Each structure stands twice: as structure tokens, then as C-alpha cells.
Amino acid sequence: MNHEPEVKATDMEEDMIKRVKEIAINAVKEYKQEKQIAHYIKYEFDKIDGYGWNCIVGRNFGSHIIHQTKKYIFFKINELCLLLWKA
Amino acid sequence: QQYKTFMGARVLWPPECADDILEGAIRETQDALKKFEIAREGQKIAEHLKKYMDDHFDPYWHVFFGKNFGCQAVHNKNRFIYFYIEKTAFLMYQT
Amino acid sequence: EEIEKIVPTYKIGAMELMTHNICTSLSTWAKEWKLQYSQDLHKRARQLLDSLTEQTKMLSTKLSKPVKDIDSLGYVMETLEQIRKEQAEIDMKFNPVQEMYSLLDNYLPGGITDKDEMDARSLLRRNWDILIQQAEIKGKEYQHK
Amino acid sequence: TDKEYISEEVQKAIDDSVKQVFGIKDDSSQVTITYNKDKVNLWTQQIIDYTIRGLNKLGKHFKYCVTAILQQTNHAGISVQITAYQDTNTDGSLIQCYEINDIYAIVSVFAMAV
Amino acid sequence: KEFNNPINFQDTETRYGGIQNQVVNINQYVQRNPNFIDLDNIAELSEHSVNTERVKTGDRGMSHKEGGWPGNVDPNEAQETGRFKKRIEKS
Amino acid sequence: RKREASLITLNYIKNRFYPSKIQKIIKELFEDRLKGVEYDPNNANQLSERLVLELREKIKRGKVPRYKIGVQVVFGEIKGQGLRIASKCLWDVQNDNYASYTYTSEKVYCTGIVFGCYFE
Amino acid sequence: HANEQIIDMPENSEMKSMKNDAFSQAKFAVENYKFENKISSHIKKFFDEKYGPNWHCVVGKHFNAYVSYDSKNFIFFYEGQLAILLYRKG
Amino acid sequence: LTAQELNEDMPSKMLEPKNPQAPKNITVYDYYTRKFKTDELVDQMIVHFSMDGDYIWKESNEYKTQEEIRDTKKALIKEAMRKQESEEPGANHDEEAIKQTLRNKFNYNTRECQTINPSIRERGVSTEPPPSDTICGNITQWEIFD
Amino acid sequence: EPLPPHIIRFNDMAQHLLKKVIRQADVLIKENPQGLEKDIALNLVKFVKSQPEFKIGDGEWQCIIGKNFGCSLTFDANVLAFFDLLPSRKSILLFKSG
């Protein structure tokens, strides 16, 4: 079984964060590969939140990235860490 | 399951690992075992081999040889080497 | 475990020795030792929480300020950026403190500052979660400001 | 001569495969499928399977190596060259270059006796 | 008979692949303001189980309460013994 | 080892470690003959052929004899031009192999695929 | 009778669930399956389910082994006669 | 998918499309499934040189999208330029400065995020079974009775 | 001019720019070894931003450093530099997204 994620660092609207964890559970079951997961997230988020978008899916990594305000969200599912942002 | 004899060693014939990494690997164990014996000081020769793999090939090799054991492990594409020599069976896989 | 397993009496050809008599004394003295190392830790562990209770307080004060004046915004703007950096670094810095205070509990027959500190540790983690929520609300208030 | 290698037969096999993937033929560009980065990866796996299956059908006791080179809308000096260390009166190899609208594709076929 | 290579195997022929030169414009626009690339760092994994060949363990139960006879003669059977005694007394 | 002595009868094989040994041999040759990475005119196509002839002989030298060698070289200009060179050969599993190496310069790319098939 | 083990598991921050399930599974896995390979398939599959993937475990009566692991995920215990080894890496 | 008969009743073999160098299976842990998932079937197709390159043709589907992105960025710059030119008297702000002027501290925050990675560690474990001692016993009828 | 050991996965960037990033990246990991990936990421983005005639415009420089990560990003034409340093064995992703 796969329980719902937990948002560590986040800047999303009460409506949006639901749509992100939504797309997150759909993506993880559909695609096995770590790059294929990311590839789905972005292309779905290109329909809802305009052309420009980016997504990473790392078991162990770190960064600082420049993101549009209210268009950043980092959620860690059980032993996997997904970082997505805008522009 | 079908084994085969190449470079004086009894390996699983469908060579999971690439045939260069396998040849250099078996040859180093045979040249390690010509020095240190498995019966006496058997921990040392594993640690010698483990470090050798990290030098010449990609890092984080796991090394497992015994007269009797049974393992199911996840490894990278073409990074799994399992060969018998006399009676002792040598397993190792890159991560 | 050496004082656990220590033999209570050994013997030779024509003599018995009673070890318990000595052995019993060594338990209460090598305990005093671990009690010391646990009270070299206890003071270390408590100085981190204090640093982590303040740091979280120090950031909450900048939010508590009205910040009506121009020059005031420029001060507490750098602190929201500080909050973020903390948010990244702190989730790393936290993991040691959570285990440090645990490990202690198992090794100290003391019940750490009654319940006053247990409450202060649970309040800290709540105060951090409130701060993140407050920083999101402040971010919106900031855009209108 | 039941077995033996023939120039014409191989060429016919590759034509059928290139047609099977996206060639109604008939002397008019009835279709037009410009080269996507997504579709390229699929086409290669499709073409190569179809070519082999094509060679398989009429196949004798010849081993068959086939390489698929695609090219994004030419404009770039590419030159393919093939050499086979193999007895003459035994086997021959062939390459055939196709000019299919936007996509450009070269197919090679090695023949080896068994 | 079986499979041997005495026949010369040396000869080599080449062929020359190419494509036909076209127009410079090509009616295509170089690059995209943005570009979309999906970079993995992880290496595709595959699991293989290997177990050391356990030597086969037969189980057999034989009594030696009987004395040492020949093979052809049965120690239980009275006939087999009775004849073999009569064969010794024939010197 | 009667099954092993048997195994030699059905197929002699002579499985000379084909993959990386050749991959190392072709790599060493390519670097030297590429010379100027910048050079990709129309008069170097004829010179890119000469490379391919030399290549196949050094495959014979590198402990192959009994195998049957077929090599295909591709020399092309890159201008962010998206192309994929795949291959798939019908052969005897674990009885034959392939060797591939690709060298990418700033302005030029050269890929060398080498096919070897056992024959008796 | 498991005289000398090596326990390098987290223990602190209620991760004893991930050490105790090493001793607990081992006992249930060994008695039922009774095949060295199939043990290493059962214990691994469980520890992947609960604590996420990239666990490697190797079960043998007599073996040598040197290996790289993730600090505070490696435990080496004797279940009866048999000698089970499991650890994370990646 | 054919078979070679070998001369003088040798063991039959054959020749399969599948490339041997390619891995046998490929296993990629699912988080939804929550257990490792093996795929015996593989793509078993070798690629020497793969190259994905930015290069689009006039009137694609992918171009139209690229144009919309330019037109949105342009519109935001145009508005931001015009509004700064309308608010200020005879504004001499260059189009490059106006973009840098569009990216704010409260219109593009810049967060750092890493994951907690355990430090790698290399350990040795040698398992040697109990010593096995030879014993020699004889039993006779008298020694039993004695 | 020496260049430290590295493996290119994908380089959609000019050679002059890439070489200048790798040198810094090697020196920057060598400064704080067994140091956190975000600490190395932060200082690397500062360098590439700070250096003049390194800017290709559009987005803003943003660097991701890890040992294990897949991804899919939209970046500016000829501005993305992926590489993995052989002695460290840590991948480095650096690009501008508009």
C-alpha cells in the first residue's frame, strides 16, 4: 500500500496542493521509471498552469532553484522526494 | 543454471556482466587466491577484491564468496558476476 | 554486561573467593560513570533545544512587528529569506536533536525536567509548523503590503 | 539453387518494411509524417522488427544484421560506409538510402552463411 | 563429417552509403525558445538470484545382522544356503 | 567434465571476449584518425571511407580470426540535429556478439558499429 | 547459538520497528521456506515493502563477505544454525 | 525465427532475433505497488548513438506552442514597459532593465531543498561454522553389559 | 589549462562555458568534501551568475546536485549543462528555465 504524501517545503494555494498530490499518486502507479514519473507530472501541469514548468524525482539530491511565487511545491512520498516549480 | 569453464574458472555461462569486467575480475581473484588462502584469513581477500573493483570499475561493488550460501540481489545492467573455482563460489554485483 | 555476566564466586585447589562483595561495589561506580557521560550529553542536548526554541522565537518576533514603515519591510524581508534557508538546513539539523534527546531518555534514570521540557519540545515542533503556516499567510499579506 | 543470397530479394524486403511503416507509395505524397523526437524512438524499433520479419519470411539459413540510421531533415553532411570480412562466393551485404519527405533514413543489411 | 574450417575466409568488399543534397532554407526554424529534456542519473537495475549447488542427500537403511555369504546366494532364503553348504561338501 | 567436452562438439564457439576488447581497439584507432575535430568538408567523405578499411583489418589483428567480421562506420555533421542510430542482428544467442563505440566532438560525431558472427 | 552478532541499526527515533522486524521475519522465513535463496527473496521483499527499496540480503551456512552499506541500516544475526545478513545501499 | 540443423547429427541449435548483450530482465521498484517489479520481456534492440536535438519545422504543432510562450512573455514585458512608461513622466527605461525590473523578491522567491542521505560505510563479516571433531567408538556385547 | 575528471551525460552548451563550470564545480566540492549538496549548489549558482559574459538571458541560473535523481525540465536553447565528476561520483545539473 502507498499512503498519501507529506509536503515538506511548499508555496501552493489550498485548491492547488490537492491537485498536486492528486497528479502525484496517478503518476507513481502509471510509470515505474524515475524519469518517466517526472515527465508525466510536467506535461499534465502544462495544461493547468501555463507552458512553463519543471519537475525532478530524486531518492537522494539537493538544490536551490528560482521559482514563481505561489508556484512551488516539494512533497516527499514514502522514501522518494519530488521537487516541482515554475520558470 | 547451466555453468561453463572459461579462464580456469566455473562461471554461469550467460555472462550477466560485460565480458571485459568479468575477465579482469576472475583473473584478479585467481591472482589474489594464489597469495592469500580462503581457509585461513578469508575476510582479508574479500576486502582486497572489493577495493580493486572500485579502482578499475564503477564504485559500490558488493562481494560475497562462500562454500555454501544462497542470495537474491538487485544489481545494475551488466554488473553481476557469479563464478565457482575448485569448490568455492564467488558472487559480486555493482550498485 | 561484564558486571551482569561476572561470575559470583571462583575457586582454586584449596581456596574460594567471594566476588559479589567487590563486584556489587563496581556496578554502582561504573553506573556513576555512564551517569556522568549522560550528564555531559544532557547539558549539550539541552543547549541545542534552547538554541532551536530561541531561533524559532527570534523569527516569530519579526512577524509579530507591525512593519508599517518602509525601512521596517527591508529588515524583516531578509528574515523570510532566512526562514526559508532555516527551513532547508533545520530539517537536517533537527534529525540529530530528535535522536540525541531519545538516546538520552533510554540511558538516564532521570525523567528530563519533569514534564516542563517534554511540553517545551512538543510546543517547539508545533511552533515550527505554525511558523511555516504564518510565513505563507505573511507572504500574501506582504504582496498586499 | 534453393538456398543462396540475392541482391534483388533483400532490397524488396527493405522496400516492404519502409512501406509497412509509412509508404502507401503510388507516386504521390499521400501521407506526410515530419520527424518528432518522440516518434523517432518508436519508428526505429518498428522498422527494424518489420525488416527482420520481412527477411525471415523468404529467409534461408543466413544470419541477418540490420542497422537503422534516421536523419532529421538532412542539411548535414552524413556519409555511411560498410565493409564485410566475408568470402565473396559465400555472402554479400547491401545498404539502401530512402528520401521520405521530412525524415531521411538509411538501412543496412549484412548477410552471413550458416 | 562434423564442422571444420579449412576453407580460406579472407575476401572483403565495401559499399558507400550517402544521402542526396537539398535546399539551404529547408523551411524550418532552428531551436525552440524553451527545450524539454528528461535526464535520468540512475542506472536500470535487474535482479538475479544465485544459490550454491547443495550436494544431493540420499537416505538408505541396510542391516548387517546376517553373516557374510556370497552375492548369488541369499542369507534369509533357506534353500539358497542349504544348496551352497551341499556344494562345499563334494575335498 | 564430459558435458563440457560434449559442449565443444555441438558448437566449438571459440568465444573470444568480443565486446569491450574490440570497443577498446576501435576507440584507440578512431581518436588518432579523426585528427582535426573541426574538419567535416565534402572532400573528407572520401577520407572517412579510408578510415573504415583500416578499421576492419585491426579487428582481424585483435584476436578474432574464426569469427566473420562486418563493420559499418557513420561520419556526420551535428547542428543540434536529432537522429538515433539503432541496430538489431539475427544470430546465435551467447555464440555471437556486437561491439559499438561513439565519439562526439564539438562540431562532429563518428559512430563505429562492428558485427562478428562465428562460422565453421 | 548466536554468540556474536553485529547490530548497526538506528534504534533511536522509533526505528526499532526496522531492527525487531529483522529478528522476527528471519525466524518465520527460515522454518517455513527451508531454502537459502528463497529466504533472501522473502526477508528482502518484506524490508522493501515497509522501509522503501534498495535492500540487499544474503543467507548462507558458511560464507565470507565485505560490502558497502548505508550507515544505521546493516544488521548481522544468526537465526538458529543459519547466518542471515541484510543491509541498505542506495 | 528459424532453426539450423548441424551436419552429422550434432545437437540442433537456432538463431533468435534477440540481442544477447542486452540484459535478461529489467526491474524498477514501484512505490504504488510498494514492492520490486520484474519485467522478463525487454526491448532487446541495441542503439549505437542516440541524439535528441532542438530542430523544428515551420507550422509544426510544437512551434505554435513555442510562439504562444514568446507572445505571453512579450505581453507581460509590453504591459510592464507601458505601465512603467505611463506611471513615470517620459520614462527612459530600456526593455532589458524592465525584465530585470519585472523579476522581484515578492514575484520570484528562491528556495533551497535537499533530501537526508545516509553516509555510505564499508564493513566485513566472515561466518565460519562450528568446529567438527572426529570421534571413534567401538561397542562389544561385554562393554554394553559391563 | 587542466580540466578535472568528469562524465558528460548531456551537454547542450558551448564548450568555453562548460569547461569554466566544471573547473569551479571540482574546486567547490574539494573545498567542503562530505558537505551537503545544497551548500555546493548555492555557491555554484552564485559563481556562474557573478561571472560576466556567462549570461545567455531568458530564465535565471538554477543548479541541482545529487547522487540519485531523474527529472524533466524546460530550459533555454544551448544553456543546460549536465556532468558527473569521477572522483566525487556526484551528478551536477545547471540550466536556465523561462
Author numbering:
A (entry chain M): 1 to 87
B (entry chain J): 16 to 110
C (entry chain A): 1060 to 1204
D (entry chain N): 4 to 117
E (entry chain E): 12 to 101, 104
F (entry chain O): 13 to 132
G (entry chain K): 4 to 93
H (entry chain D): 61 to 206
Task: Quote the authors verbatim.
To further understand why microtubule binding is critical for the TTH interactions, we performed cryo-EM on free OADs. In the absence of MTD, most free OADs are too flexible to support a stable interaction between OADs. However, there exists a notable preparallel conformation, in which the motor domains are stacked next to each other. We obtained a free OAD structure in that state at resolutions of 5–12 Å for different regions. This transiently adopted preparallel conformation is different from the fully parallel structure of arrayed OAD. Upon MTD binding, free OADs are induced to adopt a stable parallel conformation, primed for array formation.
